[PDB]
Design a protein around this ligand. Sequence first.
Ligand code: HEM
Ligand code: HEM
Ligand SMILES: [Ca+2]
Ligand SMILES: [Ca+2]
Ligand SMILES: [K+]
Ligand SMILES: [K+]
Lengths: 267, 267
Amino acid sequence: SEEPPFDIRALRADIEDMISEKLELGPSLIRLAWHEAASYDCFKKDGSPNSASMRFKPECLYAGNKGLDIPRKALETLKKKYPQISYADLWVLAAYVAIEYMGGPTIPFCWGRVDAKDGSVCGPDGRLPDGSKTQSHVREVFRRLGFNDQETVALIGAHTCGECHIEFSGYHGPWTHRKNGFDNSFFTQLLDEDWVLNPKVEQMQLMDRATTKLMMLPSDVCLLLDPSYRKYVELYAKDNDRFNKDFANAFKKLTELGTRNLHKAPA
Amino acid sequence: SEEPPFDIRALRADIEDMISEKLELGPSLIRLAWHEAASYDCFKKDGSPNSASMRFKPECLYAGNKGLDIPRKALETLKKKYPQISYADLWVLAAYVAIEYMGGPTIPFCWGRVDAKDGSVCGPDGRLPDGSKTQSHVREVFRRLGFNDQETVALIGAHTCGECHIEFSGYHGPWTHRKNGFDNSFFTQLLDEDWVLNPKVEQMQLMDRATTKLMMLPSDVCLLLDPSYRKYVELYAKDNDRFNKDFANAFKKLTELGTRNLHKAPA
Ligand code: HEM
Ligand code: HEM
Ligand SMILES: [Ca+2]
Ligand SMILES: [Ca+2]
Ligand SMILES: [K+]
Ligand SMILES: [K+]
C-alpha cells in the first residue's frame, strides 16, 4: 500500500540472515514482540503497547522480561543499518519474519509505530502472565488485553516454538519435539500425552510420560482443564490450517494494540 | 499439672463422641486449629494466633477459611456444655483429640488461651498458604510462622487426613487412600506414585497414575521438588514413628504460637 521510509525488502532479508545464523533467535523474537504488546490494558487504554518501551527501565527489568535483552540487542544491529525503522516496527516485523521462517503464517505487516522515547510511559509491573498460574489468571490477563478465549488459545500456541531457560524463567526445556518449527504441535501434545510431574526441575512443570522430553507449564495445561479453552485446543489439534489462520489474525491484533496511523506494507 | 476450670476428661469424651458420629469432622477440626494459628507473623509478632479470632469478621470470610464454619459450629455445642473453656483452647483441644482419634500422636495439651473478643485483633488476609503455589510460597509462609523445613514438612503431612471440597477450595477429593486415618501415607504416596495431571478437575491438581483416586496439590508436590523438603519427605516416608513424634512437636508449637501463661493439663 504505502512504501515505508526503510528498505523493507532488504531489512526482511537481513532479519532472515540473522535468524539463519542463530536459529534460537526466532522464538525469542516472537517472545519479544509479544511482551512489548502484553503491557496493554484495554479498559484503561494504557501500558504503551507496541512502542518498544521495553528498551527502558523499569520495564526492561520486570521479571517476566528476563532474557529479552538478547533479541533486543540482536535487533540493535539492524536498527543501525536501517535507522528509519522504529524499534517498535522492527520488533514486530522481526517477529513476523520469525513466524514465517519457522513455517507459520505470513502475517500482513503494517508499519508506522512510534517509539517510546523514555521509560515514563512504561506500564506497571504485574501485567505479564505467570506460567505457574492457571486459567483464572490466564483469562484475566487476556481479557485485559482484549482477547476472547479463541484468540487466547491460538496465541499460546506460539509455545510450539522455542524453549524455557532456567536463567530467565526458572523453567527448563522445549515444549515440543521440534522447537524451531511452527505448527499445531503444542495442541496435539497437550491432548495426546500423559502429563506427569517432572521431579528434576525445581519449578513445577510437567513432562510427557512417553519420552520425558516434552514439557508443559501449569499455564499451558490449564487450557486442557478449562472447558472453554479445551474446545479450542481440540479445534487446533485437528486443523493446522485453522490454527495458522487464527494465530495470524490474533498475532496481528496483538501487535497492533494501542496503535494508530499505521500503513499497509508492500508485500 | 494444673486442673483446668472445665471438666477436661468429660469434654474429651464428648469431643470423641462428636467425632464418632461424623468422622469427617476429625480432619476439619485439625484444619480449624491450624488456620487459627496460621495468621501469625513471628517477625511482627501479630496476627493473634490461637485466640479463636476466626469467629469474627473479617477473618471468618477469608477465602482460605471457607468451610471452617462447620467445625466451629460443631464445637459451639460443646462450648455451651463446657462454658469455662475458651474457644481458643477448645479448638486446640479438639484438634489434639482428633489427631489421636485417627491414630496419630497424643500431644500434651496446655490450657489457658484467652479468646479474641472482637474482629479488630484479626490479622490481615493473605497469610494463609495457597495450594496452587509451590515451595517459594510455602517456605515464605512457614518461615513467617517461625518453622524450619523439617517442621514444615511434618506439618503438611496432616494431609494424610481429610479431603478437599469443591465448595471450599475448588479442589476435590482425599489425598490418601484412608482419609480418616493418620499416618505417614502422604509421604509414601508422594514418593511412590506417578503424579499425573487430573484432567477432570478445573483447579489443577494431580492424581496417581495407578488408581487416579489419590490426589496432590501443587503445594504438596513442591515438597518433592525442593531439595531440602524432599529429604524430610524421604525421612517420614521411611519412619512413621519419627513422623508421629515430629508432627506432635510441630503441631504443639503451632498451637502455642503467640500464647502466654499456659498450664499443663492433667493427662
Ligand atoms: C498464559 C500465557 C503465557 C505464559 C504464562 C507464558 C510463559 C512463558 C515462559 C515462562 C517462557 C520461558 C521464557 C524463558 O525461560 O526463556 C515463555 C517463552 C516463550 N513464549 Fe510464552 N507465555 C505465554 C504466552 C505467550 C504468547 C501469547 C506468546 C506469543 C504469541 C508467547 C511466546 C513465547 C515464545 C515464542 C517463547 C520461547 C522463547 C525462546 O525460545 O527464547 N508466549 N513463555
Ligand atoms: C502449604 C501448606 C498448606 C496448604 C497449601 C494447604 C491447603 C489445603 C487445602 C486447599 C485444603 C482443602 C480445604 C477444603 O477444600 O476443604 C486443605 C485441607 C486440609 N488441611 Fe491443609 N494446607 C496446608 C497446610 C496444612 C497444615 C500445616 C495442616 C495441619 C497441620 C493442614 C491440615 C489440613 C487438613 C486436616 C485438611 C482436611 C480438611 C477436611 O477434611 O475437612 N494443612 N489444606
Ligand atoms: Ca510494552
Ligand atoms: Ca488467627
Ligand atoms: K514446534
Ligand atoms: K490417611
